[model samples]
Target: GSLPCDICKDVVTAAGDMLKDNATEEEILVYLEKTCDWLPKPNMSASCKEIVDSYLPVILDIIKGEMSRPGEVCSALNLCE
Candidate 1:
C-alpha cells in the first residue's frame, strides 16, 4: 500500500464518520480538512492531506455513492488489502 494500510483505514474511517450523518457537501469538504490532522505526527498528517487532495473525487464518490464501510472503502481504492 502506498499509504500504510492502517493509515489508509484510519483516514477512510474518519472521513466516513464525519460523512455518516446528513452532512452537506460543504460540510463534508470541511470535515476533510480535519481528517488530514487525524494522524498524531506531522509526517503522516501531511501525507494524509496529500493523498486526499489528490484523489478527492474518487474518494467522495465511493463514500457518497456506495456508502461502503471504512475497510471496504479503502479496499476499493486499493489502499488496503
Candidate 2:
C-alpha cells in the first residue's frame, strides 16, 4: 500500500490552528517541532527535518501579513488548497 500522507495533513492542521490564534513565528515553530515528532524517525532523518523546515518558513511569511481583515489570514495560509 502507498504510504499515507498523514504527516502532511497533520502539519497543515496544526498550522491552521496556530494561525487562528495569531501565533507568532517562534510559537508556531515551537509547536510544530513538538507535533511533528510523530513523523517517522522523528528527529534523526532528513525527511522529517525537511518537512518541518519547508513549511514553517512559508507559514511564518503567511502570518506576517496584516491579518485584521476577516478571512484574509485564512486565505493566506489556506493549506487545504
Candidate 3:
C-alpha cells in the first residue's frame, strides 16, 4: 500500500516527527499500512470504502463553510484542516 518500507519511512519522517514516539520502525510501518489509500484493489472492503467516502463530505463542508473565514482559523480538533 506504500512505496516501500525504507522509502516510506523517509517520506513520513520528512513530513513531520513521525519517528518521535516510542513506536519502532516496524510499528510505524504497520500504522502506515492502515493509513494508505489503496484504490482499485480487489482486496479492499466495503467498510474501508465507506470510511474513505465519509471524508469527502467533511472535506467539502470544510471548503464551503470554514475556508472563507478570516485567516488562521484554528479548531481544537481540526489542527490538520
Maximum-lDDT candidate = 1
Candidate 1's displacement at residue 1, Å, is: 8.6
Off by more than 4 A, model 3: 1-16, 37-81
Q: Regarding TM-score, does 1 or 2 come out ahead?
A: 1
Candidate 1 residues 1-81, lDDT tens each?
Answer: 556566667656666666677666567666666867877889888877776676555766777785757777777777778
Residue-level error in angstroms, candidate 3, position 32: 0.4
Error of 2 at 44 (Å): 8.4
**Clash counts for the predictions, in order:** 0, 0, 0
Please give the CA lDDT of all the candidate structures.
0.69, 0.53, 0.35
| Local error of candidate 1 at residue 68 (angstroms) | 1.4
Runs with alpha carbons beyond 4 Å of true place in candidate 1 = 1-3
Alpha-carbon TM-score of each model against the true structure: 0.67, 0.54, 0.27
Write down the worst ten-residue block by lDDT for model 3: 68-77
Q: Considering TM-score, which of the candidate structures 1 and 3 is the better prediction for this target?
A: 1
Candidate 2 residues 21-76, lDDT tens each?
87776786787776556556634335445666875566445545533232343244
Per-residue lDDT of model 3, residues 1-81, tens digit only: 222322223323422233444445455445444554453453343433343343323422443453422112212113223
Error of 2 at 20 (Å): 0.6
Q: Candidate 1 vs candidate 2: which has greater lDDT?
A: 1
Residue 35 lDDT (model 1)? 67
Off by over 4 Å in 2: 1-4, 38-46, 59-81
Least lDDT summed over 10 consecutive residues: which range in candidate 1?
Answer: 1-10
